[PDB]
Structure formats: C-alpha cells, structure tokens
Amino acid sequence: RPDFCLEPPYTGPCKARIIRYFYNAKAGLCQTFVYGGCRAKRNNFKSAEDCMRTCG
C-alpha cells in the first residue's frame, strides 16, 4: 500500500553499486536495481523478503 511502494526505483547521485530490491507495482513482484549509495528512497530494501513484506 505505501505510496512510496508505487514510485520508480531511484538510483541516486552517488556512485556505489549496491544491488537493492524494490516493489514493481504493475508487476506485483519486487525486483533488482542499483542504488548509488545516497539519497535512498523508501522503495529500496536489502532483501527480497524486506521488500515483499512492506509492499506486498
């Protein structure tokens, strides 16, 4: 439900390569994306579990 769950995966201005999971709204499944390491947004977790437990 969290509205931030429906926002697109935000990478960020920094340049780290941290694979993170985000919920794919029109796909019901959480997926992978790269987080720059800064300014993270709410729809970015560490495990598929964490992702699917709050955006299911």
Binding site: T11, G12, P13, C14, K15, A16, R17, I18, I19, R20, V34, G36, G37, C38, R39, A40, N44, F45, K46, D50
Partner: protein
C-alpha cells in the same frame, strides 16, 4: 566508467576493488601504502540494515583486472581492520566525502600492485589538466558494471564553472573533472576509486576520489570528486602515512 577503454595488467596498480558480504563489488579504493586505502565515504554508511561501516563485512582486491577471474597470480586479497569516514562527511550534501581503510595483513608490492602518490598539501591541478579515472563502474548510465577495470581520460575544470553547472551544490572539498560535452565520466560502482594524474616528474598522483554526479557522462554534468590535497594532513594525522 563511461567513454573509456580497457586498462592493462598493472596499468593502475593502485586501483582496488572493494566488495561487501553478499553483494560483490561495491566501490573502488586507492592504495596509499602497505596498510591503507583512500576511498569514498558514502560507500561505508550503515543503511537498510547492513553495516556498510563494519570492516568485517569487506574484502579488498589489490591488482585486480578481471572481476570474473577467480584466484589470480597477481591479485592480492585482504580483509579490513577498520574504516575511518571523515568526521565531517555529510550523507546528503556529500561534503567531506572521503574515508580511510586499513588493511589487516599488509599489501606486498609487486609489478601489479603499487601505491599511488599523494599530492602534498599545496599541490595544484590546474583546470584543463587531463587526468584519469578507473574502475569497474557501470559502462553507461543505467547499465551494468564491467568485468575488466576500464580507464578513461578527462580533465580538471574551473571551480566556478563547476559550482554553476551544479547550482548550490559544490563545496571547496569538491572538484569537477570531466568534459562539458560529456561522453566520458565515472559512473555507479566507480565511487572511492582514485583520479590518477600523471605529473611533470613522471609519477602519478591521486587528485581525487570518485564521489557523485548527476547522471553519468552528461553534457554540462561532469563527475564530482573529492579534492585530495585538503586531506593530506588528515591522512597523515590518522593513518600516519
């Protein structure tokens, strides 16, 4: 990085590949001595339940060339004793984005694993001066990393130009390096990596740490890195190097 080409065995002996438990390669670092590195700061900031600051979660790769190559004759592997993010780093404005990583067991210099040279407090890298960026970062914004340490050539830029290309964002500890027409620039996964500069004497000196930038290789959006001089004494004061 973007717009660059494959480097050669040992072309950048000071480059390093940093990995974190369950995540593979994350950032790059710079070998500044037998027991220390010089990376970013954001790379080691506890987030999403992972201790990105905890040294027990990191492995460093000296002399690395091919990421998919397991066990290599010229690649050293070491754990970290401790990380020292700058006491005035800012996870948001990106100021003081710099940190020191201490190796447990020392590095053992060789043809493919040599320490880069630190600019002395007052060194200057005049704008327009070509320098190099290296890393396994994404090869085009929004893509994937590279198996082989890529190399790219960019140049220093006027500070005001920098400040104004990225409105109300640049700080004295920062420095724009790249091109106005982009095409070449550091990208995700390159962070902490060292800007290598060939100096008039023949030796290469670290002139910056990959930090951030809006996008990658965009026109009017050159990479933003951490100036290395202002922290020379901070290094001396901490590492002891």
């Amino acid at each position: 990085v973007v717009g660059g080409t494959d480097a050669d065995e040992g072309e950048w002996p000071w480059q390093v590949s940093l990995h974190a438990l369950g995540q593979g390669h994350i950032c790059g670092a710079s070998l500044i001595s037998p027991n220390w590195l010089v990376s970013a700061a954001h790379c080691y900031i506890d987030d999403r339940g992972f201790r990105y600051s905890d040294p027990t979660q990191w492995t460093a790769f000296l002399g690395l060339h091919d990421q998919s190559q397991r066990s290599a004759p010229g690649v050293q592997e070491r754990r970290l004793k401790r990380i020292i993010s700058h006491p005035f780093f800012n996870d948001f404005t990106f100021d003081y984005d710099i940190a020191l990583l201490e190796l447990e067991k020392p590095a053992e210099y060789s043809s493919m694993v040599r320490p880069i040279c630190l600019p002395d407090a007052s060194h200057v890298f005049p704008a327009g001066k070509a320098i190099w960026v290296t890393g396994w970062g994404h090869t085009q914004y929004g893509g994937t990393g590279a198996l082989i340490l890529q190399k790219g050539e960019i140049r220093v830029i006027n500070q005001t130009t920098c400040e104004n290309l990225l409105p109300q964002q640049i700080t004295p500890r920062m420095m724009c390096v790249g091109f106005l027409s982009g095409g070449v620039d550091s990208c995700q996964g390159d962070s902490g990596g060292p800007l290598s500069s060939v100096e008039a004497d023949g030796r290469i000196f670290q002139a910056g740490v990959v930090s951030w930038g809006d996008g990658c290789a965009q026109r009017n959006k050159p990479g933003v890195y951490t100036r290395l001089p202002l922290f020379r004494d901070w290094i001396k004061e901490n590492t002891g190097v």
